[PDB]
């Protein structure tokens, strides 16, 4: 692959967080487990 570098400005480049999930699923006729863990940050507004 070719090299990629975002440009550098006098400002600060901090990408905002998206959302985090933990998809887990277990397939066995003895027991089936399909629990899930999900979490994210409020991106409705910068102040909140």
């Amino acid at each position: 692959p070719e090299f990629q570098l975002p440009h550098i400005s006098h400002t600060i480049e901090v990408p905002t967080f998206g959302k985090l999930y933990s998809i887990l699923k277990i397939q066995s006729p003895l027991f089936t487990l399909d629990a899930n863990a999900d979490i994210g940050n409020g991106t409705t507004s910068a102040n909140e």
């Binding site: 692959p1 070719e2 090299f3 990629q4 570098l5 990408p15 998206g18």
Partner: protein, 288 residues
């Protein structure tokens, strides 16, 4: 002793029964040159003797040196040779070495040169003992600075054929690796064992972009006594992309033991938008 130069010649003979000694020297001075010759001959028996030829020639801007010796003993032989051409701004070394005994003969080839401030080396070693050969090849272009290397070892036998080919260049900026190993074991001691070997490693290294491909194919069957046919199959591929733009990697460990097979699909992901991995374990187990 004269104004032209020194002359020295010493000849000692000796003979009795079977052991006969014939030794002579040749030492003269001609202006700025030396003509050396010591013909040393030690004949003890017909197949049991020794020879030595030491001859030195001195001249400006050059060197002549001849070194050949002979040695035998009935069923045993050992011979060697050497060429030394040392000259300004260059180098030229060659010769021969060979040791043979009855059936098993070992032959070696060597030659050392240097020109344009670049070293040159090449070695060949051929071993043939009890019908088992050993073809190990080392290629030339061995200089030291931005040079290359290439090794070729070949093993052939009635129970194992081995073959590996390696080729790599240690360039200052880029870097390459070529590994290709193939083997096949044929063992019959207490059951049949097919030691089949499949190996391949490749790698390309360069600044801010690293990558590598490894593929392995290990399958070996064990046909023992009392229908103990054991099939061992281990197949994995190693791959990952290493660059600041993106980081990732894939690894598929595929193995099986007779009726019990396991697979794992291991993949790594790391980009500026997301990062994470995936797990998938499939197990097939028998019994109760």
């Amino acid at each position: 002793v004269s104004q032209e130069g020194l002359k020295l010649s010493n000849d000692m003979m000796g003979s009795y029964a079977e052991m006969k000694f014939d030794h002579t020297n040749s030492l003269n001075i001609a202006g700025l040159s030396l003509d050396f010759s010591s013909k040393l001959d030690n004949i003890y028996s017909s197949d049991k003797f020794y020879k030595q030829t030491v001859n030195l020639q001195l001249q400006p801007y050059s060197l002549v040196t001849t070194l050949n010796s002979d040695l035998k003993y009935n069923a045993l032989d050992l011979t060697n040779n050497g060429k030394l051409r040392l000259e300004p701004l260059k180098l030229h070394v060659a010769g021969n070495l060979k040791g043979a005994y009855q059936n098993n003969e070992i032959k070696h080839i060597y030659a050392i040169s240097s020109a344009a401030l670049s070293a040159s080396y090449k070695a060949d070693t051929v071993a043939k003992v009890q019908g088992v050969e050993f073809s190990h090849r080392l290629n030339t272009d061995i200089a030291g600075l931005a040079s290359a290397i290439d090794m070729s070892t070949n093993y052939n036998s009635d129970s194992l054929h081995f073959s590996n080919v390696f080729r790599s260049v240690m360039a200052p900026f880029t870097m390459t690796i070529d590994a290709h190993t193939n083997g096949n074991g044929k063992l019959a001691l207490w059951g049949e064992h097919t030691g089949q070997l499949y190996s391949k490693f490749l790698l390309k290294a360069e600044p801010l972009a690293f990558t590598f491909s490894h593929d392995y194919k290990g399958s070996t069957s064990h046909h023992l006594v009392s229908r103990k046919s054991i099939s061992a199959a281990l197949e994995h591929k190693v791959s990952a992309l290493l660059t600041p733009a993106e980081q990732t990697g894939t690894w598929k460990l595929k193995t099986q033991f007779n009726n019990n097979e396991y697979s794992q699909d291991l993949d790594a992901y790391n980009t500026k938008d997301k990062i994470g991995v995936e797990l998938t374990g499939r197990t097939l187990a028998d019994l109760t």
